[PDB]
Amino acid sequence: RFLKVKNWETDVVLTDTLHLKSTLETGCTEHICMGSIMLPTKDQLFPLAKEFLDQYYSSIKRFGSKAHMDRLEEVNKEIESTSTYQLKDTELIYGAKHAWRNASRCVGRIQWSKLQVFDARDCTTAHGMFNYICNHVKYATNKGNLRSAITIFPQRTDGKHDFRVWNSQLIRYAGYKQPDGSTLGDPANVQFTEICIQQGWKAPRGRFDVLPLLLQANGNDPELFQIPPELVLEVPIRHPKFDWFKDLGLKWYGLPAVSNMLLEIGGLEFSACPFSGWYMGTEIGVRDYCDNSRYNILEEVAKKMDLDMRKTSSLWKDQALVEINIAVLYSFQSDKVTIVDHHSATESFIKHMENEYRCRGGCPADWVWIVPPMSGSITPVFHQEMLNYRLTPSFEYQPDPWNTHVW
Amino acid sequence: RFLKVKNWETDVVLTDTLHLKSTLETGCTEHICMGSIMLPVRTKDQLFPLAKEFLDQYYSSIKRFGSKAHMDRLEEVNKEIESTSTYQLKDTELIYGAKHAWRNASRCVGRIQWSKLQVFDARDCTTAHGMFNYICNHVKYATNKGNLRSAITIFPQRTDGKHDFRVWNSQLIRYAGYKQPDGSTLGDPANVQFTEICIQQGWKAPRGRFDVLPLLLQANGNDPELFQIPPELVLEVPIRHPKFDWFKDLGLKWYGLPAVSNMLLEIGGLEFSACPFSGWYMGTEIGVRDYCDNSRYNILEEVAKKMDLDMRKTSSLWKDQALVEINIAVLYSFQSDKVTIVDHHSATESFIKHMENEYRCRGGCPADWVWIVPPMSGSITPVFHQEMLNYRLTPSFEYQPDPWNTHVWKG
Ligand code: HEM
Ligand code: HEM
Ligand SMILES: Cc1cc(N)nc(CCc2cc(F)cc(CC[C@@H]3CCCN3C)c2)c1
Ligand SMILES: Cc1cc(N)nc(CCc2cc(F)cc(CC[C@@H]3CCCN3C)c2)c1
Ligand SMILES: C[C@H](O)[C@H](O)[C@H]1CNc2nc(N)[nH]c(=O)c2N1
Ligand SMILES: C[C@H](O)[C@H](O)[C@H]1CNc2nc(N)[nH]c(=O)c2N1
Ligand SMILES: [Zn+2]
């Protein structure tokens, strides 16, 4: 019940006690492990509020103080009365930072305490949402010197007045299926791209078209907005050795900004809470470019490299993959846009884990997501045993809005 | 109940009902997943239900469930247990058991081959010398001059846990490791403890970087004895690179036959503590793990040095570049010497086909994603995108503690 995790490359052993504070469920049982599955009233609200307020006042070393009890009392009163409650700015910031801290699938959490939190709870319209999001993007991008940030729109009330960003990321490329039969641009975004067009958007029908924002305030119909191009920092992808690489015509955007998740703090639900950091190179070079269900350029690159693509055992896919990921890192670094390679990022996470085990008693971590999609075992996280469990505050998935929206 | 797994690249969805037949635990709870943890004595009491369940499965597979042969066998095993406190498997049952232990091995990506396993019955063995002979025959059979053949040799089952047969080696063929006074290691660092034991038992070590370890064999609970595998039985492959001529001068080689010899085979409640099995290598086992783990031969530096890569910052991906070249060399060398090997793209593609087939005919396929996904180029293999369910079926292979930690020495 007091658990140990071992690193098999270093023999370092850490003792986990934090998991005992876990609340939600993992999807696993004693009979079956679901570790590789992608997606497994007034009464309930006050205990949730109490659990959060307790950990908050503990963190500021005022557990059991007058101010603690008073606040517990005040929130209790507000829930009995209004059937909900509002977070103090200090509580909102703490809650958001700890949602990141608790994100077991995130390798970048060593940065968790340096999150810029933008309070957008006074927002009432989609035009206001757009304004807040432009300011976010500009602050976060910072001329290529990226800074982590989250913008938090008003919390769910009766589930009919939800704030939602319909895009999965603030910045993403459009996808269109060709009459020919293939897919132009990003296949991942074919459905969403349709809903943009099938709602007003005029598509350039290109390969790297930055999608418009589809913003929904207070449960209303969502509205289209184009992010000012001058706020969208993109990087042309070239290679430090292969001069034909530039001719592939590839580029990617600098800002990874997830906008479709749900932030839970003290029982309150923030259905619109776009957050952003900076990329690990493999997210673009391995997944975005080389997934078969994405831009899928491996064969094209291997061809230009003149590799022997007759047999899989020549490892031509593997060679091309490395070169593509060299290009991505080289390109961002050259344009002075923040990026981290998978070696640096995983070494950072090992350091973070040790910090958390020492100062917090543990660090929930999902091995399946933490290990990079290339060169797994030559990164230290591959050899690191990890315990996965769910702490709150937390980021959670939520249904795509078009399936839920009472139109 | 139904359970569905989705492949996120193909959108293919499979339905698992087989997990309902699961008995053993996973280590996970509703509150914590232990999926990345490496490693998460038996009386007459619990034995007959274990026996019965296995025999039910056996007779079902041969389309004889409930037959007179089935009921008689149950009867016979029952009376054998209550009078002798154990029982003996028929040859047919043993073969079925061994094949299904492999079939049920959720961490094994090579299971498309499970039904083609050569089972060698060594249950009549009584001495370490007898063990050595059986093991030599296994190695010769399995190696087949490079045309590798899967096989398992099964020594007598545990009785009171005080007369165990054990192969003290983790694998039948492995290179020695030597700790030097300056803190460095000569050979395979993984095998330093075992090497020191062999030396203590009287092995005259050559003290080179690739010395094949002697077999250390325990029969019937007796102290183990040293044996040298005839070198002519140990097939090795010099490693060279198809473009880089300097690669051969690194002086690398590896053995052709992967043969695990320290696991326990459970069949119908019976425990076979010595059951060496072998197949053929996936290239990455050697090229990624054996050669490039920091705690193993660790040749990334040397290789990258000779490739003249930018080694100052990690973001040059010099480690990733060297890793691919090493794995190309391993595959090239094995194929050139006509020794059976499979690359991780072929192996994972075959596993997906296997898994889909198993869902269709068996109702499921227990699989451990953490182990099934290869240690390089993960997401460009099809298993990366494949949801998997991990659960435990029997018959099974299990870990057991190393014998030198539990053995009562006779002298
Ligand atoms: C600052 C640098 C950051 C880096 C390098 C980073 C890296 C990553 C990576 C590689 C993943 C894997 C997800 C995938 O493969 O699609 C991930 C997941 C995740 N990240 Fe981070 N991230 C960063 C910042 C942040 C921030 C600022 C937040 C929130 C405030 C965050 C929250 C999350 C969450 C909630 C997930 C998992 C989502 C899920 O469950 O699917 N990350 N991160
Ligand atoms: C014939 C070709 C085979 C291939 C390519 C293959 C491949 C693999 C690989 C790559 C692993 C991961 C282990 C590691 O990374 O160290 C593995 C695990 C395993 N294999 Fe196979 N294998 C083969 C044959 C067999 C046979 C013949 C048996 C048994 C009769 C077997 C039983 C197992 C078991 C039980 C594990 C899991 C070990 C554990 O739980 O830690 N395999 N295999
Ligand atoms: C802030 C941030 C930094 C970074 N460096 N990277 C990302 C993107 C990674 C990511 C984070 C999430 F919080 C949620 C998701 C969605 C999961 C995706 C959707 C489809 C495939 N995958 C399941 C991705 C975000
Ligand atoms: C038949 C076979 C084929 C193949 N292609 N390959 C192997 C070796 C893979 C393997 C299988 C096992 F049943 C147990 C182990 C030991 C795991 C090691 C020991 C220490 C670190 N690691 C946990 C390896 C065996
Ligand atoms: C901590 C983690 O479970 C451990 O390093 C595992 C990860 N996956 C693996 N997968 C395979 N095939 N072989 C291994 O030795 C390991 N090691
Ligand atoms: C089926 C499997 O869970 C799925 O492919 C996961 C595996 N691990 C991952 N890991 C990360 N970081 N991102 C992903 O999208 C995935 N996909
Ligand atoms: Zn689990």
From Swiss-Prot, chain A:
It is found in: Cell membrane, Sarcolemma; Cell projection, Dendritic spine. Ubiquitinated; mediated by STUB1/CHIP in the presence of Hsp70 and Hsp40 (in vitro). Isoform N-NOS-1 is expressed in brain and colorectum. Found in the Auerbach's plexus of the enteric nervous system. Isoform PNNOS is expressed in the penis, urethra, prostate, and skeletal muscle, and coexists with the cerebellar nnos in the pelvic plexus, bladder and liver, and is detectable in the cerebellum. Heme b binds at C106, Y397. Changing Y279H: 50% decrease of nitric-oxide synthase activity. (6R)-L-erythro-5,6,7,8-tetrahydrobiopterin binds at S36, V368, W369, F382. It comes from the Eukaryota. L-arginine binds at Q169, W278, Y279, E283. Produces nitric oxide (NO) which is a messenger molecule with diverse functions throughout the body. In the brain and peripheral nervous system, NO displays many properties of a neurotransmitter. Inhibitory transmitter for non-adrenergic and non-cholinergic nerves in the colorectum. Probably has nitrosylase activity and mediates cysteine S-nitrosylation of cytoplasmic target proteins such SRR. Inhibitory transmitter for non-adrenergic and non-cholinergic nerves in the colorectum. Homodimer. Interacts with DLG4 (via N-terminal tandem pair of PDZ domains); the interaction possibly being prevented by the association between NOS1 and CAPON. Forms a ternary complex with CAPON and RASD1. Forms a ternary complex with CAPON and SYN1. Interacts with ZDHHC23. Interacts with NOSIP; which may impair its synaptic location. Interacts with HTR4. Interacts with SLC6A4. Interacts with VAC14. Belongs to the NOS family. The PDZ domain participates in protein-protein interaction, and is responsible for targeting nNos to synaptic membranes. Mediates interaction with VAC14. This is Nitric oxide synthase 1. It comes from Rattus norvegicus (Rat).
UniProtKB/Swiss-Prot annotation, chain B:
Heme b binds at C108, Y399. Signal peptide: none annotated. (6R)-L-erythro-5,6,7,8-tetrahydrobiopterin binds at S36, V370, W371, F384. Ubiquitinated; mediated by STUB1/CHIP in the presence of Hsp70 and Hsp40 (in vitro). Isoform N-NOS-1 is expressed in brain and colorectum. Found in the Auerbach's plexus of the enteric nervous system. Isoform PNNOS is expressed in the penis, urethra, prostate, and skeletal muscle, and coexists with the cerebellar nnos in the pelvic plexus, bladder and liver, and is detectable in the cerebellum. It is found in: Cell membrane, Sarcolemma; Cell projection, Dendritic spine. L-arginine binds at Q171, W280, Y281, E285. Belongs to the NOS family. Homodimer. Interacts with DLG4 (via N-terminal tandem pair of PDZ domains); the interaction possibly being prevented by the association between NOS1 and CAPON. Forms a ternary complex with CAPON and RASD1. Forms a ternary complex with CAPON and SYN1. Interacts with ZDHHC23. Interacts with NOSIP; which may impair its synaptic location. Interacts with HTR4. Interacts with SLC6A4. Interacts with VAC14. The PDZ domain participates in protein-protein interaction, and is responsible for targeting nNos to synaptic membranes. Mediates interaction with VAC14. Produces nitric oxide (NO) which is a messenger molecule with diverse functions throughout the body. In the brain and peripheral nervous system, NO displays many properties of a neurotransmitter. Inhibitory transmitter for non-adrenergic and non-cholinergic nerves in the colorectum. Probably has nitrosylase activity and mediates cysteine S-nitrosylation of cytoplasmic target proteins such SRR. Inhibitory transmitter for non-adrenergic and non-cholinergic nerves in the colorectum. This is Nitric oxide synthase 1. The lineage of its organism: Eukaryota, Metazoa, Chordata, Craniata, Vertebrata. The gene is Nos1. The chain holds residues 299 to 718 of 1429 of the full protein.
